[PDB]
Curated annotation (Swiss-Prot), chain B:
One GO CC annotation: extracellular exosome
Entry's localization field: Cytoplasm; Nucleus
Segment of the intact protein contained: 46 to 260 of 264
Name of the molecule in the record: Proteasome subunit beta type-4
Induction of expression: Up-regulated in fibrolamellar carcinomas.
GO annotation terms (biological process): negative regulation of inflammatory response to antigenic stimulus; proteasome-mediated ubiquitin-dependent protein catabolic process
Molecular function, one GO term: lipopolysaccharide binding
Post-translational modification Phosphotyrosine, affected residues: 57
Family according to the record: Belongs to the peptidase T1B family.
Swiss-Prot record, chain C:
Keywords per UniProt: Cytoplasm, Host-virus interaction, Hydrolase, Nucleus, Protease, Proteasome, Threonine protease, Zymogen
Gene name for this UniProt entry: PSMB5
EC number: 3.4.25.1
UniProt key word Transmembrane: no
Superkingdom of origin organism: Eukaryota
Recorded catalytic activity of this chain's protein: Cleavage of peptide bonds with very broad specificity
GO cellular component labels: centrosome; cytoplasm; cytosol; extracellular exosome; nucleoplasm; nucleus; proteasome complex; proteasome core complex
Organism: Homo sapiens (Human)
Oligomer and partners: The 26S proteasome consists of a 20S proteasome core and two 19S regulatory subunits. The 20S proteasome core is a barrel-shaped complex made of 28 subunits that are arranged in four stacked rings. The two outer rings are each formed by seven alpha subunits, and the two inner rings are formed by seven beta subunits. The proteolytic activity is exerted by three beta-subunits PSMB5, PSMB6 and PSMB7. Directly interacts with POMP. Interacts with ABCB1 and TAP1. (Microbial infection) Interacts with HIV-1 TAT protein.
Gene Ontology molecular function: any one: endopeptidase activity
A GO BP entry: proteolysis
Upregulation: Down-regulated by IFNG/IFN-gamma (at protein level). Induced in breast cancer tissue. Up-regulated by sulforaphane in breast cancer cells.
Protein's name in the database: Proteasome subunit beta type-5
Lineage, uppermost ranks: Eukaryota, Metazoa, Chordata, Craniata, Vertebrata
From Swiss-Prot, chain G:
Protein name per Swiss-Prot or TrEMBL: Proteasome subunit beta type-1
Top-rank lineage group of the source organism: Eukaryota
Coiled-coil positions: none
Keywords assigned: Acetylation, Cytoplasm, Deafness, Glycoprotein, Host-virus interaction, Intellectual disability, Nucleus, Phosphoprotein, Proteasome
Compartments, record wording: Cytoplasm; Nucleus
Record annotation: effect of changing residue 75 to H: In NEDMHAL; uncertain significance; results in impaired proteasome assembly
Family: Belongs to the peptidase T1B family.
Disorder this protein is connected to according to its UniProt record: Neurodevelopmental disorder with microcephaly, hypotonia, and absent language: An autosomal recessive disorder characterized by microcephaly, intellectual disability with absent speech, severe developmental delay, short stature, and hypotonia. Affected individuals also manifest aggressive behavior and have hearing loss.
GO BP terms, alphabetized: proteasome-mediated ubiquitin-dependent protein catabolic process; proteolysis involved in protein catabolic process
InterPro entries in UniProt: Ntn_hydrolases_N, Proteasome_bsu_CS, Proteasome_sua/b, Proteasome_suB-type
Modification Phosphoserine, positions: 34, 40, 134
Gene source species: Homo sapiens
From Swiss-Prot, chain H:
One Pfam match: Proteasome_A_N
UniProt keywords, alphabetically: Acetylation, Cytoplasm, Glycoprotein, Nucleus, Phosphoprotein, Proteasome
Gene Ontology BP terms: proteasome-mediated ubiquitin-dependent protein catabolic process
Organism placement in taxonomy: Eukaryota, Metazoa, Chordata, Craniata, Vertebrata
Gene name tied to this protein: PSMA5
Name of the protein: Proteasome subunit alpha type-5
NCBIfam families, sorted: PRK03996.1 (NF003075)
Modified residues (Phosphothreonine): 48
């Protein structure tokens, strides 16, 4: 071996570049996502406004279908390509199969594309890791994650990007089975996760939800402001 | 070939005791005009098998070329192994079938005669790939005319001698000279035994016309 | 050749004859026309033997692959759609195929109708074959939604009897399959002459 | 000493070391000679049994390309087998396209171009073979050519390929080669091969002799060497 | 040592060492022995296992009605050349409607393995073929090599520690030609019992025998038509 | 290999025979002498079936 | 012009017994109003328990026989066991549809034993359907042979006639009589009869002549 | 050096294959056991998170109605091979109306276990355990990345497979029963795992000739674990 190229095993049995293309994901912006029982929720941090532009084009949360939602980390160009191919693939699934697209299908497609992309000669691995949240079969909320290796892996909540161990540790130290959702608890759980963000500046918070029958709703950072205020009120009630 | 330009005519072949005799004539008629009245329509393959054909003569030249090259190749292998005549028959059948599958048939009618390892062989190959074995073969109008003489004597006597076989071939070719319009009084007889392959010269027929003095 | 299909309160009824001629000559009397695709799908044979048999076997292949990849059994409309899309790629090259697709769904009953001309349509009653018009007649006499089970059995059986009685290209054993909520169940295989003695009076 | 890796690159003094290394690859191979007479060409190969595991009649380096052409290869054996198949194919194209026997000059030039085409590019290596080509024709006489690993192909009366390349042609050239028919040349080649390396480094060798000319009426085949047995009853008289 | 990397590179001594390395890769298989009489050709191989509980990796495999091969070395290339072997047999069985003579088949094998020994991008096939067959001129025992310099013998043995087998074949190659099947097969395993270290004995489950005959179709044997073959022996001269 | 390494093959073949206490040598004693002169082998073996 | 098909004719019969499958066929190969031979057996012994007969265009019959033999050897050399009968039937159906858009002009009847050791006859069509029936007659004498087998094997259209299982020698005398009766009215039937019998112990053959015209 | 799938060693060998056999060792353990009563099989999941939903991690997948499987090491090479095995067994049933036997399945897989070639892609990094019930009864099968496929009576894979084999050779013989083999496997499991054995760690997969369908045990596995 060496860190060159993607095809050689290590002398102790690793692929260097799979572990190494995860590092670019590990060094990206944070985005979390949970499932409530009826409403699914996710959101990104780090709006990072540079005082002189628009930001409606830099949106890290998009959709492929009327049922499914996106997120990513890592570098954004691979996200743009994968999202472009995912739209085409989701529509081609809609072409033959007349269903609303199951989330498991589009995650298998993304991971399969990612792995057959990684196997080949000198194609640079996609340095992203997506979050694919949706609720199709009887409105059952699901969220899967990806990896530069190409392993779709179903969870109930998630944290990626920079310092994701602390954020997932907050979902570990919070995550109550009770009750239920209760969309209010899911909203407050998003509020606690975004308060538990790596920075939590209060204005760099961007969150979007889906109530498993509607479409994506982009919020307004005053409802979130009153959410942060009542989180601070409950924190005062702790004293 | 869709339209046969220069056709041959009927080929006769019959086994006998330890050998096969084949005789075909030497005419290259185009339409009704007998344009090529001295040509050879039998290839003497290496030492055992032997080929005679009908239909388009150019295709016969082509198969002569290809078979000659294959026989030369196996003899240049130097292994002491040859093609059995039945293998040649199989190869030619597969060749014609793969030819006609592409809707470009070889307009031919081929007869393969061989003697190897004590046993005689006499095979047939059609244009359509229809292929079988027989104690006596007859192509073109020979299957209409000289076939019942062969099947008469073979029913009355299943085996033959070389002299009787050659005489019967002479009589059948006499009859074919009598009433085939595409026929000619010049033919060559080719014979295989264990002693090798032999091509006899351009023989002829002895005819009768004593019915013409009647009205 | 005469097939029909109709769904009702208690599932779907499918019946067919078993005569398959060759020109003016009858080849067989026991051609099982309703091709058993799955333990939850039933396909038929409606115009042409080889085309219907081959393409439905390939559809069964595709359905088993779909279930083993998604861990969830395919719907009916998806299967009919896959069959129509696969048949459509040889349009004009001379495929004759007029089968029907039946099965149970998450939505419940499912009944589609796929041609080699690609007329993929849903519906409630269908009938295919040379003597299909006779079946349409007697079926649209006896059709309702609130029928019983043995009533629907008698309706379909009487229907195939009338169809084979008038048409010349039909006869043989009367198959009769019944699709339930869990899976399909063969009801009976009745000969024509037994029905003639029983229903002639 | 370089710069010896690719077959495309040159040296600071201007030659390809791949071709040189392939030329001296055949130097370790068995000694194979050839010589023509005024009505034929005679081949002869010093062939060695490994120890006792052979069958005396396997893997004969005297090939037979066309009805009147055969090879007398020396070097890497499988590469020579492939080259012999290429030569059979080229004679096949000529026989199929022109209806008569290939002239030996044109065949040798096509084969030399084929060998040169394997010396050109960097994906492939040069051949590790060096072989002989004989023929006979009624309107052409006897022709003996010679192909190196590089692809230089021209003609000889006699040649030798193997270890004793010099040590055979030292006494090949003292033959009165024109005035002899090949039936003398048979025992001549027998005595020449029998001179070199009786027992010194190896234990035992064995003789094969190919044979083309007017006496075969234009055919090319191995001699009936057992008939007239001309080596040994003269080889035992060649030790004194 | 920097020229000793690829197939394409000639050495400055002219010996492409990748061929030598493939030879040594052939040398690390199991032992196997092939030998012929005038009328019957017998090849006997030796099995090995990964553990006690596992089955033994088989070596003698079928090819055709009169062709069967032994093997040593890699197994992916073994099945690749197996598929090529079966394919080329049934091809001429289709076209010419005859069984193939063996020499032209092994020439096709050499011509097959020539291309991965000269261009760049494929490795030479680590392979240990011992081929038994019947053309019109009797039984044949051919062997191959990764250099495609296929040999014909009357008795060979390739693999690990196969040289004592070769000594046995040398001191019985005069005796081989006359005998019938039974003592021939026990000569074969009186080579294999010297392909083994002396502190253990050849059992049933580790040996395999394949006979092809001039009237006998090629047949592989394992433990049950080998229990007849395993009796009729004495111990080694300890 | 040189002269000294072949002498080492001789001595290591003697010692490898002495591991089983053999009275006279054998051929694979020499072969394991070749392997141990180089570095060693076992063989492990696999992929050679 | 060139016509790609020609009608060679022929007659193949099969009878599925309790533990036996008898396949018989004439050996006349003709064309139009001529006779090419009086020995060309339509029967072929595939395995120890499978016999196939092939009529129609003769060259396609030969080609199909060779392809089936090749795939039989491929299945054996891949999976260490011979095929069943129904597996061969399915494979033949896949082949006959794999040349759908330029069909074989071949009627096909496969007889043989199942895995329970009972008779099974799988008929065919030129395009690739099949079914497990007890008796079929393919070729020129199809219509001359089906109603008599309906009378005897099926016991159809009869009254107060009980059903006796079909024995062996009863089937043999049936086959001999039906080939005589069909050779009386057909022009594509006669000069020999090659009867193949598949038991649980192998394949038997039997040669019965006919009228020589 | 050794660098590359197209270069031998001075003594052998690859050195790409060897690094793949090295790459086996990192995976989770699994144990499959042949018994004439039927083939049983077990695995450890190594669940990381409580959010890590346990039924989504696949180890035992379904090839046929009577042919099970287990994977090792790399996940996605296993996903490719499982997909292909499903497709090709379905192809066998297509052209033959019958079940492709397990040896023929694994021959069909190891036809391209090593078809690795990037020109004229990499070798795969997964060990597979195959169980099924052919006409010859139950079968237990073990392949490797190098395609060197063999039958095994009771094979253990992946991490800590040596002591698994040793303590397996302690307990195994030819005439074992089913339930004894099940508990004999899970004893070895909770000797080679690190955490406490409970309902969510391991999963069983048993196939019987009379119970061809449902090669799985679902939360009666709880009842089996509490019997130790």
């Amino acid at each position: 071996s060496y860190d060159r190229a993607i095809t050689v095993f290590s002398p102790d049995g690793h692929l260097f570049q799979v572990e190494y293309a995860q590092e670019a994901v590990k060094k990206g912006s944070t985005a979390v996502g949970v499932r409530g029982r009826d409403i699914v929720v996710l959101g990104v941090e780090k709006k990072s406004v540079a005082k002189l532009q628009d930001e409606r084009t830099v949106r890290k949360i998009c959709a492929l279908d009327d049922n499914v939602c996106m997120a990513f980390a890592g570098l954004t160009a691979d996200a743009r390509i994968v999202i472009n191919r995912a739209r085409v693939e989701c529509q081609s699934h809609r072409l033959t199969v007349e269903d609303p697209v199951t989330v498991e299908y589009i995650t298998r497609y993304i991971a399969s594309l990612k792995q057959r992309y990684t196997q080949s000669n000198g194609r640079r691995p996609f340095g992203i890791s997506a979050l694919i949240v949706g609720f199709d079969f009887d409105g059952t909320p699901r969220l899967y994650q990806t990896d530069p290796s190409g392993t779709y892996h179903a969870w109930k909540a998630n944290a990626i990007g920079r310092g994701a161990k602390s954020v997932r540790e907050f979902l570990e130290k919070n995550y109550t089975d009770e009750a239920i959702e209760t969309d209010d608890l899911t909203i407050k759980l998003v509020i606690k996760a975004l308060l538990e963000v790596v920075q939590s500046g209060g204005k760099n918070i961007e969150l979007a939800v889906m109530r498993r029958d509607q479409s994506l709703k982009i919020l307004n950072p005053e409802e979130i402001e009153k959410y942060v205020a009542e989180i601070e009120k409950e924190k005062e009630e702790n004293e | 070939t869709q339209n046969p330009m220069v056709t041959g005519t009927s080929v006769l072949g019959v086994k006998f005791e330890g050998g096969v005799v084949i005789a075909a004539d030497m005419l290259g008629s185009y339409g009704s005009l007998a344009r090529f009245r001295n040509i050879s329509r039998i290839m003497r393959v290496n030492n055992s098998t032997m080929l005679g054909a009908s239909g388009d003569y150019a295709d016969f030249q082509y198969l002569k070329q290809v078979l000659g090259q294959m026989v030369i190749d196996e003899e240049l292998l130097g292994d002491g192994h040859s093609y059995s005549p039945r293998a040649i028959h199989s190869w030619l059948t597969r060749a014609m079938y793969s030819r006609r599958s592409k809707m470009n048939p070889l307009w031919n009618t081929m007869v393969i005669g061989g003697y190897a390892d004590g046993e005689s062989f006499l095979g047939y190959v059609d244009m359509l790939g229809v292929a079988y074995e027989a104690p006596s073969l007859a192509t073109g109008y020979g299957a209409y005319l000289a076939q019942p003489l062969l099947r008469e004597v073979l029913e009355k006597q299943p085996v033959l001698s070389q002299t009787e076989a050659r005489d019967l071939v002479e009589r059948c070719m006499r009859v074919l000279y009598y009433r085939d319009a595409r026929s000619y009084n010049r033919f060559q007889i080719a014979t295989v035994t264990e002693k090798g392959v032999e091509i006899e010269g351009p023989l002829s027929t002895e005819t009768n016309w004593d019915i013409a003095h009647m009205i | 050749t005469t097939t029909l299909a109709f769904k009702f309160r208690h599932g779907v009824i499918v019946a067919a004859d078993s005569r398959a001629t060759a020109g003016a000559y009858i080849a067989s009397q026991t051609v099982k026309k309703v091709i058993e695709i799955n333990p939850y799908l039933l396909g038929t044979m409606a115009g042409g033997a080889a085309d219907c048999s081959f393409w439905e076997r390939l559809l069964a292949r595709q359905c088993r692959i779909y279930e083993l990849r998604n861990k969830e059994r395919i719907s009916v409309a998806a299967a009919s759609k896959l069959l129509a899309n696969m048949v459509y790629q040889y349009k004009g090259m001379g495929l004759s195929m007029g089968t029907m697709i039946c099965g149970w769904d998450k939505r419940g009953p499912g009944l589609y109708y796929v041609d080699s001309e690609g007329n993929r349509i849903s519906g409630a009653t269908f009938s295919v074959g040379s003597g299909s018009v006779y079946a349409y007649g007697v079926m649209d006499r006896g059709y309702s939604y609130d029928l019983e089970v043995e009533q629907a059995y008698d309706l379909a059986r009487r229907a195939i009897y009338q169809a084979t009685y008038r048409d010349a290209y039909s006869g043989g054993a009367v198959n009769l399959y019944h699709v339930r909520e869990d899976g399909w169940i063969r009801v009976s295989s009745d000969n024509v002459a037994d029905l003639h003695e029983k229903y002639s009076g | 000493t370089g710069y010896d890796l690719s077959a495309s690159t040159f040296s600071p003094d201007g030659r390809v070391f791949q071709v040189e290394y392939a030329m001296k690859a055949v130097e370790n191979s068995s000694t194979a000679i050839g010589i023509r007479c005024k009505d034929g060409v005679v081949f002869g190969v010093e062939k060695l049994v490994l120890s006792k595991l052979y069958e005396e009649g396997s893997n004969k380096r005297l090939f037979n390309v066309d009805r009147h052409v055969g090879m007398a290869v020396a070097g890497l054996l499988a590469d020579a087998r492939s080259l012999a198949d290429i030569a059979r194919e080229e004679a096949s194209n000529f026989r199929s396209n022109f209806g008569y026997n290939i002239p030996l000059k044109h065949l040798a030039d096509r084969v030399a171009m084929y060998v040169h085409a394997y010396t050109l590019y960097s994906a492939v290596r040069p051949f590790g073979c060096s072989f002989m080509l004989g023929s006979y024709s009624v309107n052409d006489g006897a022709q003996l050519y010679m192909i190196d690993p590089s692809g230089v192909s021209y003609g000889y009366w006699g040649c030798a390929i193997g270890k004793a390349r010099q040590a055979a042609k030292t006494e090949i050239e003292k033959l009165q080669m024109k005035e002899m028919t090949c039936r003398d040349i048979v025992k001549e080649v027998a005595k020449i091969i029998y001179i070199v390396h009786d027992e010194v480094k190896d234990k035992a060798f064995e003789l094969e002799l190919s044979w083309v000319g007017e006496l075969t009426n234009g055919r090319h085949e191995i001699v009936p060497k057992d008939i007239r047995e001309e080596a040994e009853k003269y080889a035992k008289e060649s030790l004194k | 040592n920097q020229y000793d990397n690829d197939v394409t590179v000639w050495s400055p001594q002219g010996r492409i060492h990748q061929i030598e390395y493939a030879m040594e890769a052939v040398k690390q298989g199991s032992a196997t022995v092939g030998l012929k009489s005038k009328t019957h050709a017998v090849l006997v191989a030796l099995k090995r296992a990964q553990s006690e509980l596992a089955a033994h990796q088989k070596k003698i495999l079928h090819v055709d009605n009169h062709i069967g091969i032994s093997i040593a070395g890699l197994t992916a290339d073994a099945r690749l050349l197996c598929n090529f072997m079966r394919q080329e047999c049934l091809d001429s069985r289709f076209v010419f409607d005859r069984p193939l003579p063996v020499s032209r088949l092994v020439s096709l094998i050499g011509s097959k393995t020539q291309i991965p020994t000269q261009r760049y991008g494929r490795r030479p096939y680590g392979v240990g073929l011992l081929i038994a067959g019947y053309d019109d001129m009797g039984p044949h025992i051919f062997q191959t090599c990764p250099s495609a310099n296929y040999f014909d013998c009357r008795a060979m043995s390739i693999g690990a520690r196969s040289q004592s087998a070769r000594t046995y074949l040398e001191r019985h190659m005069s005796e081989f030609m006359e005998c019938n099947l039974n003592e021939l097969v026990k000569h074969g395993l009186r080579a294999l019992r010297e392909t083994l270290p002396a502190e253990q004995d050849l059992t049933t489950k580790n040996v395999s025998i394949g006979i092809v005959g001039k009237d006998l179709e090629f047949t592989i044997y394992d433990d049950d038509d080998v229990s007849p073959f395993l009796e009729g022996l004495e111990e080694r001269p300890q | 290999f040189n002269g000294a390494q072949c002498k080492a093959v001789c001595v290591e073949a003697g010692m490898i025979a002495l591991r089983r206490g053999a009275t006279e040598l054998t051929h694979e004693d020499y072969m394991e002498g070749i392997l141990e002169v180089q570095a060693k082998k076992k063989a492990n073996l696999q992929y050679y079936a | 012009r060139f016509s790609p098909y020609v009608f060679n004719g022929g007659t193949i019969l099969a009878i599925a017994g309790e533990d036996f499958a008898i396949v018989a066929s004439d050996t006349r190969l003709s064309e139009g109003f001529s006779i090419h031979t009086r020995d060309s057996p339509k029967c072929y012994k595939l395995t120890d328990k499978t016999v196939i007969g092939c009529s129609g265009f003769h060259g396609d019959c030969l080609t199909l026989t060779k392809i089936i033999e090749a795939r039989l050897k491929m299945y054996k050399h891949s999976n260490n066991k011979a095929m069943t009968t129904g597996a061969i039937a399915a494979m033949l159906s896949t082949i006959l549809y794999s040349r759908r858009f330029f069909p074989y002009y071949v009627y096909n009847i496969i007889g043989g034993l199942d895995e329970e050791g009972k008779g099974a006859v799988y008929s065919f069509d030129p395009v690739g359907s099949y079914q497990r029936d007890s008796f079929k007659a393919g070729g020129s004498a199809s219509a001359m042979l089906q109603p008599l087998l309906d009378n005897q094997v099926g016991f159809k259209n009869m009254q107060n006639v009980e059903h006796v299982p079909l024995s062996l020698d009863r089937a043999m005398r049936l086959v001999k009589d039906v080939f005589i009766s069909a050779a009386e009215r057909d022009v594509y039937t006669g000069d020999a009869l090659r009867i193949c019998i598949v038991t649980k112990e192998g394949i038997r053959e039997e040669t019965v002549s006919l009228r020589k015209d | 050096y050794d660098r590359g799938v197209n270069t031998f060693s001075p003594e052998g060998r690859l050195f790409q294959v060897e690094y793949a056999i090295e790459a086996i060792k990192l995976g989770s353990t699994a144990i499959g056991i042949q018994t004439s009563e039927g083939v049983c099989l077990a695995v450890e999941k190594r669940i990381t998170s409580p959010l890590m939903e346990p039924s989504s991690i696949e180890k035992i997948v379904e090839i046929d109605a009577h042919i099970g499987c287990a994977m090792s090491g790399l996940i996605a090479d296993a996903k490719t091979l499982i997909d292909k095995a499903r497709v090709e067994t379905q192809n066998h049933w297509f052209t033959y109306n019958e079940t492709m036997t397990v040896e023929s399945v694994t021959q069909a897989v190891s036809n391209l276990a090593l078809q690795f070639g990037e020109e004229d892609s990499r070798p795969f990094g997964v060990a597979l355990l195959f169980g099924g019930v052919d006409e010859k009864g139950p079968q237990l099968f073990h392949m490797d990345p190098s395609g060197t496929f063999v039958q095994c009576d009771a094979r253990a894979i992946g991490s800590a497979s040596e002591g698994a084999q040793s303590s397996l050779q302690e307990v195994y013989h030819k005439s074992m029963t089913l339930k004894e083999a099940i508990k004999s496997s899970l004893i070895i499991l909770k000797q080679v795992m690190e955490e406490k054995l409970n309902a969510t760690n391991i999963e069983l997969a048993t196939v019987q000739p009379g119970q061809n369908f449902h090669m799985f045990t679902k939360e009666e596995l709880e009842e089996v674990i509490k019997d130790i």
